[PDB]
Amino acid sequence: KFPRVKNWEVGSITYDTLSAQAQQDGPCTPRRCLGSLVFPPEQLLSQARDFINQYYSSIKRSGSQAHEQRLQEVEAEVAATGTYQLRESELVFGAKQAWRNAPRCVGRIQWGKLQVFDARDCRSAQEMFTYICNHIKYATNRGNLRSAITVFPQRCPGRGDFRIWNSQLVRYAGYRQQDGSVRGDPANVEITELCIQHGWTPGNGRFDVLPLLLQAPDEPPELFLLPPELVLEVPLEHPTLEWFAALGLRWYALPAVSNMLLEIGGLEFPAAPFSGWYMSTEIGTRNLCDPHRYNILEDVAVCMDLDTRTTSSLWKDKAAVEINVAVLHSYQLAKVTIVDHHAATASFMKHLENEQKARGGCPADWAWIVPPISGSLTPVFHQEMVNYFLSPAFRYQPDPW
Amino acid sequence: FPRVKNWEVGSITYDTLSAQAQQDGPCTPRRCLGSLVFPAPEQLLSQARDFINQYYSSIKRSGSQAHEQRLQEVEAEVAATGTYQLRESELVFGAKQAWRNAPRCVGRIQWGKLQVFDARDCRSAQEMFTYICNHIKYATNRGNLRSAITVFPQRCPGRGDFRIWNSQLVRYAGYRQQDGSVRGDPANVEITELCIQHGWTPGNGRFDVLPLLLQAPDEPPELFLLPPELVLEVPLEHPTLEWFAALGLRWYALPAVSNMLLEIGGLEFPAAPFSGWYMSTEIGTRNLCDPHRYNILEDVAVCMDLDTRTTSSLWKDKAAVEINVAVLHSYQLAKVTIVDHHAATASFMKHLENEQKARGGCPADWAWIVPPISGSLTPVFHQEMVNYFLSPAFRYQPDPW
């Protein structure tokens, strides 16, 4: 009943006893596995009680007098108002745990180091924009990136929601044509046409930084431009292919995801943007080489004078590696924090070891932990994993439109 | 029915075929175990009936008098004897269906092209060896590789099974060095020590072809030496790195898995070796660069004058790509069939499309279908997959010792 977990490189065996505490059900059944799919009152009280019990257990104040007082407080608040309020310390712990619980995050070695900005007093999109700019400023830190989350007011009944319509704080526009294709990032064609309708006059470049569509409850969203000095970017060059710089490729320093819902003790924060730093394959492999993203692989291979008319020359593999080399080199030259996929998967193995001792396992999504190049060259390829949902959690949520 | 999305193209299918899954997998709504490597006459009759229905469906004669008579014939034989015999045509169809149903096989575009050798009248380990040698001869075909399976007698009560103890017909010895290390292939250390145990004089090279341990019913295994002219091998060289040839690397032409159980209509064939041809990442990435296999990555990188002290030079990725290049170049030079991971995954995408039309789905294990290098450079990375167990099937089975 406790799954056996084997590492095939070393032969080590562990047992995931944590999977028993999985609060929610995932998409798989004994009949069929859907692990590869991207998108798989008294009720509030039971989740709220569960989280408080987690928190006090985690500070060794379990069952003490402060534990019961907080339990009765949430009872009264929910009866009085329909909801309740986290103490600032509970919010901090709950955000760290939602990161710690994210099965698809290879960066969780860092989970204990997260700057939490409490923006639960926010109202209006103008204040929203100020909190976000402070977050971006703090997290970018002149290239020495620091992990941070900003928590905007929770959802509650009768009232609208706070939403960041952009999937990330920094996104490059994507524009379609009468020739059908996209110039810029195809991933952002939708948010680009939304920003246009809500005021923004569009650029025409391959890396036009999008504005922010920030939404206060019930109010339509307001359009905000980001101070260019706030948005650190890294122009991409290669250490030995001197023509690589002339492709005009660039990427931004700060990955800051703004469209996920943070859930803590049954509360729901539809706007809680978090940022850390990049793993280099996210940029060099997925963002630049995916067929449905910038799709630059063949351009680079033509410049490397590779034989592209036969798959078996491995021209795709060679071009991809050099693009990832360029990313690592360009970020290091610019003194912007970045981690290559070998270092990051090595640290995730350590995190698996630490979590086994900390709580008897660790939820992990193999398909997302294994890097998209050089999979089996990294230790996580050889590591069996168990995926399950724990709360607090980061969850997907529907688009505000 | 599970909705299945391709994220490159945006296309969407529903896997209705999964609803027919017979046997249960390892996953539950509470936890996904999809990344784990190793997860009475009445049941026989329902399995036989289903298989007979499958056969008559395949030849577009469902509900025909021949269909009904054959069901009654199977029913009568099971009632009288507790088991039954396949018709030859059913054996051929069942072996092809078992390949078609194998979720971890990326080469299933070929599933209709399989030479089925019927060895169900085999009576001794010596006759086994003759049947195996003819298989290797046929399938190797002096490098123009042809897919084939040889089906030895089914399991039946009151008699031991036929078994091939070796995991493949052609395997390199793995000599347990006394330093706790291994000379040769570490995957084959167990079968190597059983070969010596049974009287084989061992070599000391890194690419010593193992002898076969063949088991006739109720008989200890017997040792048989493969004729050297029957075992086609490919010396490994690199098209532009001339020193690569001096590594002394080799691999064999013919991948012929011999330790899986073939299951058709509830009958079980514990010895049914099958062979096709290699996808190059199997040799170049896993067999040569896995840390727990030949583990040549660092040595090749040093010969390439790469900086092996920092991960961020991507020296592992660069050496791995050249080793895969050497494998593809060397097999092409030797005129031995091989497919690269780009072509194989593209053909697997056509197979998924064929199977969606033909059967409404296709069982597929994403973790095994995505190649171990350049995963997201291949189209299967972006394809959601549904994993489930259909029959006929190739199954893992316990080792005979």
Ligand code: HEM
């Ligand atoms: C600090 C260094 C970090 C690194 C190197 C890192 C790395 C990654 C990577 C490579 C992914 C896969 C993303 C994709 O493929 O689209 C991911 C996913 C994720 N990360 Fe981390 N991350 C870091 C920090 C954080 C932080 C601070 C949080 C939240 C507080 C976080 C929460 C998540 C979540 C929830 C996902 C899942 C997203 C999804 O399911 O789509 N990560 N991370």
Ligand code: HEM
């Ligand atoms: C025709 C060329 C073929 C190619 C290129 C191919 C490719 C592959 C590859 C690359 C794997 C993964 C192996 C590993 O990583 O250990 C695999 C697995 C598998 N193949 Fe194919 N294959 C071919 C033909 C066949 C044939 C003829 C059969 C049987 C009649 C077959 C049945 C299977 C099965 C059952 C597995 C699963 C093995 C396991 O779970 O350990 N394949 N195939």
Ligand SMILES: N=C(Nc1cccc(CNCCc2ccc(-c3ccccc3)cc2CN)c1)c1cncs1
């Ligand atoms: N290091 C980081 N990375 C990272 C972590 C979590 C989430 C993300 C962003 N995840 C993108 C998921 C995604 C990718 C492509 C497409 C897409 C859609 C249409 C066409 C083509 C592609 C859609 C989605 C969302 N479904 C990045 C960090 C971000 N914050 C702190 S650390």
Ligand SMILES: N=C(Nc1cccc(CNCCc2ccc(-c3ccccc3)cc2CN)c1)c1cncs1
């Ligand atoms: N193209 C082909 N390929 C292929 C298909 C199916 C199975 C295989 C062999 N799969 C080996 C799985 C494996 C890998 C490593 C280790 C191991 C064990 C201990 C130490 C180190 C490694 C053990 C196993 C088997 N459990 C190859 C073909 C084979 N027939 C026709 S086509």
Ligand SMILES: C[C@H](O)[C@H](O)[C@H]1CNc2nc(N)[nH]c(=O)c2N1
């Ligand atoms: C279909 C498949 O689940 C999809 O391509 C996944 C696979 N693994 C991934 N892994 C990461 N880290 N990020 C991703 O977006 C994906 N995409």
Ligand SMILES: C[C@H](O)[C@H](O)[C@H]1CNc2nc(N)[nH]c(=O)c2N1
């Ligand atoms: C732990 C993990 O399941 C294991 O390393 C798997 C992953 N995917 C694989 N894929 C293939 N084709 N072959 C393998 O042996 C494996 N091994």
Ligand SMILES: [Ca+2]
């Ligand atoms: Ca037009």
Ligand SMILES: [Ca+2]
């Ligand atoms: Ca008969």
Ligand SMILES: [Cl-]
């Ligand atoms: Cl990104």
Ligand SMILES: [Cl-]
């Ligand atoms: Cl192999």
Ligand SMILES: [Gd]
């Ligand atoms: Gd040369």
Ligand SMILES: [Zn+2]
């Ligand atoms: Zn599953």
